[PDB]
């Protein structure tokens, strides 16, 4: 009743979290940092007034 | 009075119109005191 007490072990309980995501993951190649795009609208036809 | 004087359903109002209407439904064409007098249809 007289010494200080002993630890055995510890284990260190770690979890590794994926994605989900990263097929979605593409690289760009850290050039730039403006980029866009862009669509054409729709122009329905007309009828031929011939006059 | 009369359909085939009606002008307004012509194939003359499409072409003056920029914008006319895309599908047709038909006429109900007649022979009744027209220069088409027909006696049996």
Same mark, same amino acid.
């Given at each position: 009743? /007289? ?24 690289? $760009? %190649?850290?050039?730039? $940092?403006?980029?866009?795009? /862009? ?9 031929? %007034?011939?006059? | 009075?009369?359909?085939?004087? #009606?002008?307004? #359903? ?10 006319? #209407?895309?599908? @047709? +439904?038909?006429? #109900?064409?007649?022979?009744?005191? @027209?220069? +088409?007098? @027909? +006696?049996?249809?």
């Amino acid at each position: 009743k /007289y010494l200080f007490p002993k630890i055995n072990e510890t284990l260190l309980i770690d979890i590794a979290l994926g994605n989900r995501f990263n097929w979605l993951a593409k690289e $760009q %190649d850290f050039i730039g $940092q403006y980029s866009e795009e /862009y669509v054409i609208m729709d122009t329905v036809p007309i009828n031929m %007034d011939l006059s | 009075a009369l359909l085939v004087a #009606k002008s307004a #359903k012509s194939a003359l109002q499409d072409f003056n119109h920029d914008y006319s #209407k895309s599908w @047709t +439904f038909g006429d #109900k064409w007649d022979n009744s005191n @027209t220069m +088409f007098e @027909t +006696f049996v249809n």
